[PDB]
Amino acid sequence: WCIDLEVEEKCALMEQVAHQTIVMQFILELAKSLKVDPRACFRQFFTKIKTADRQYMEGFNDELEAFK
Amino acid sequence: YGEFYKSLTNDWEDHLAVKHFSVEGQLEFRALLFIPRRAPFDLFENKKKKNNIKLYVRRVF
Amino acid sequence: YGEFYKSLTNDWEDHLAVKHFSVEGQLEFRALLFIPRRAPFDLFENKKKKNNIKLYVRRVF
Amino acid sequence: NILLFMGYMTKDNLAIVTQWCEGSSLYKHLHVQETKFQMFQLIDIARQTAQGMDYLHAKNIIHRDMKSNNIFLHEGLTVKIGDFGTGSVLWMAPEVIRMQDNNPFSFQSDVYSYGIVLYELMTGELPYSHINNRDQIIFMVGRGYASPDLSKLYKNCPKAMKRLVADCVKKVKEERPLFPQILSSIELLQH
């Protein structure tokens, strides 16, 4: 769905949806990694990735161009 | 029972078994007990207060 | 301090150390906090609801 | 951009499941393993035993089954009394060994058995133990023709305790003290 955003250079929407994207990759990868149902994740798990060193999304700010 | 139990517990899956019963005399009550299909991910944690049974009187909590 | 502590705890030994203070402010309280000489056998084990600090108001428990 | 590695957000579970010691019964440590206690410590055990016995009586529970092998020691010499444990005769009162009436259980019956326990704590040696014939025990105890041998008691036994043992095993139930009296005596005796 974001292909129109790349074509139209819509950086702010690509940047905000990068947050939703890394969260989807976090919960689906977590579910794969633990052999569990993705529906069994919790907002405590979002709080756990809020601890110590937080995020890697500084590279995904380039994905929006690097993925073209 | 399935729709209720999802609504009672916020589970996305059905109960394994359910028991419905009642009791009469000086002490009168009705009750529903559900065995979930999965152990809760954090069932045994000793830091969490349990919500598991709720007691209502004349249908108020 | 040692006699008060033996009465309060029913310990047969004296205390190891004590902190005694007042908090002034919109909350007024005194407190005594004692460190016992030996850990109790059940320091971890008896799960239910006592860390041994009693709260009194105007000297009534 | 990449499938990047996740240092997993671990959890530390510090839950506890309790463990309990099947410790030696008093009988076992006294007559089988024959371990020894200081007089003060022997008194501490008797005191806790009385303190438990009083609580049972307050609740109107007659213990009946009072034997030194039914009393157990745990860490710190905590006494646990229970139903958990010859001895078919030895600890029972003269009317009870006789089956003199229909299960004539009373607090004094428990007192008698307590007194017998105090005797063995204060000797390291079973009552009447210069004799061991079954029918002779039923005869001589039941008809009042022998006390336990209080001449066998520890030289370090407080005279008050020697009396307490003698009092708790007085032949007539109307003659022996109840736990509140026994315990009061023990605390005074110990101090």
Side-chain angles (χ1 to χ4, degrees):
Chain A
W1 194 83
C2 72
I3 187 61
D4 298 338
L5 310 179
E6 289 179 3
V7 168
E8 300 183 338
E9 308 182 301
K10 285 175 170 174
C11 299
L13 287 173
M14 291 188 273
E15 285 166 29
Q16 291 186 297
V17 176
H19 191 59
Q20 307 188 10
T21 305
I22 191 65
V23 170
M24 283 301 305
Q25 289 170 342
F26 165 67
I27 70 190
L28 294 174
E29 181 72 352
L30 176 69
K32 289 164 185 285
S33 303
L34 295 180
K35 300 182 182 178
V36 299
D37 184 341
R39 298 177 293 188
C41 71
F42 302 108
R43 66 186 178 283
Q44 295 189 5
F45 301 174
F46 204 53
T47 304
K48 285 177 180 175
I49 71 171
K50 198 64 174 178
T51 68
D53 294 345
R54 293 184 164 141
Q55 295 289 273
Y56 314 92
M57 191 167 62
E58 300 193 320
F60 292 72
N61 300 327
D62 296 340
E63 185 176 66
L64 67 95
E65 296 291 316
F67 205 73
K68 291 178 176 177
Chain B
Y1 288 107
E3 287 177 21
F4 179 82
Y5 165 82
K6 291 191 183 86
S7 191
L8 177 69
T9 65
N10 309 304
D11 196 343
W12 65 100
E13 186 163 37
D14 301 353
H15 55 289
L16 177 58
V18 56
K19 179 180 274 278
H20 195 314
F21 67 97
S22 67
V23 170
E24 297 176 23
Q26 175 58 29
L27 177 62
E28 172 172 19
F29 64 91
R30 300 170 77 93
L32 289 168
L33 303 173
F34 299 95
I35 295 172
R37 279 194 188 277
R38 298 293 176 259
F41 167 78
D42 56 4
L43 177 62
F44 276 113
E45 291 297 326
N46 63 344
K47 301 299 190 187
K48 181 166 74 174
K49 186 176 179 177
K50 308 309 188 301
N51 300 310
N52 72 305
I53 292 286
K54 295 184 179 182
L55 169 63
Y56 296 81
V57 173
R58 298 151 94 97
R59 302 180 298 280
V60 296
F61 175 72
Chain C
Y1 280 109
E3 291 300 318
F4 174 81
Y5 167 86
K6 285 182 293 184
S7 181
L8 178 64
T9 60
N10 200 36
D11 198 349
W12 70 272
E13 294 184 291
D14 204 353
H15 68 298
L16 184 59
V18 61
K19 192 67 175 173
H20 185 182
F21 65 105
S22 186
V23 176
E24 307 306 319
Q26 77 281 31
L27 304 173
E28 176 172 352
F29 69 93
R30 292 298 193 103
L32 288 175
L33 301 173
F34 295 87
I35 299 172
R37 286 184 181 229
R38 289 179 293 97
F41 286 111
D42 296 320
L43 181 60
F44 299 102
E45 304 194 26
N46 298 350
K47 297 182 184 180
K48 291 188 180 294
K49 302 289 176 174
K50 197 170 63 176
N51 318 328
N52 316 292
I53 306 300
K54 291 183 174 180
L55 177 66
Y56 294 81
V57 178
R58 304 183 199 168
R59 304 183 185 176
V60 177
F61 177 72
Chain D
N1 290 31
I2 70 166
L3 193 64
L4 181 66
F5 79 95
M6 171 181 168
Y8 174 69
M9 297 295 158
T10 47
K11 166 70 180 180
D12 292 302
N13 182 293
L14 294 169
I16 300 175
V17 173
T18 47
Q19 174 60 38
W20 306 295
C21 174
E22 287 183 17
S24 297
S25 70
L26 293 174
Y27 180 87
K28 182 177 180 180
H29 78 70
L30 186 61
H31 302 288
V32 177
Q33 298 172 300
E34 298 186 344
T35 67
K36 305 294 179 187
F37 288 92
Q38 295 178 340
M39 183 59 66
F40 191 84
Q41 292 174 321
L42 289 169
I43 294 167
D44 178 48
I45 292 167
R47 183 175 176 186
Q48 285 181 73
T49 306
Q51 184 191 349
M53 286 303 302
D54 187 39
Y55 181 87
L56 295 185
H57 287 184
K59 305 321 187 182
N60 199 32
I61 301 169
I62 302 169
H63 181 96
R64 298 180 290 173
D65 303 334
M66 171 47 72
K67 303 189 179 96
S68 67
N69 66 326
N70 271 347
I71 303 163
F72 300 89
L73 299 176
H74 298 267
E75 293 87 335
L77 305 179
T78 301
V79 173
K80 297 291 187 177
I81 310 179
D83 68 345
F84 182 70
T86 71
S88 67
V89 172
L90 183 147
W91 292 281
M92 289 294 198
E95 67 204 319
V96 178
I97 69 176
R98 277 186 290 169
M99 298 299 288
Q100 185 63 10
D101 206 334
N102 186 13
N103 294 313
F105 290 106
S106 68
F107 290 162
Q108 293 89 334
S109 180
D110 283 346
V111 170
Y112 182 91
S113 303
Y114 180 77
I116 297 297
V117 172
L118 292 173
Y119 177 91
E120 63 182 294
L121 290 172
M122 295 294 102
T123 59
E125 184 163 53
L126 291 176
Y128 306 96
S129 56
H130 60 288
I131 292 294
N132 56 19
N133 177 294
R134 316 301 173 74
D135 297 345
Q136 183 167 349
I137 291 158
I138 294 293
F139 163 70
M140 78 185 168
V141 176
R143 279 71 169 175
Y145 297 115
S147 71
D149 290 7
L150 278 76
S151 56
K152 302 293 195 289
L153 295 170
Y154 269 120
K155 68 182 182 181
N156 292 325
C157 180
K159 288 181 179 179
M161 181 60 81
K162 292 184 178 182
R163 289 193 296 273
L164 183 59
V165 173
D167 292 342
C168 294
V169 299
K170 286 178 175 172
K171 289 174 181 173
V172 175
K173 71 184 189 297
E174 294 81 2
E175 291 172 342
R176 69 181 77 99
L178 299 176
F179 279 98
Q181 295 171 303
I182 294 168
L183 180 58
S184 179
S185 181
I186 292 168
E187 291 187 347
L188 292 169
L189 184 154
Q190 191 173 40
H191 293 299

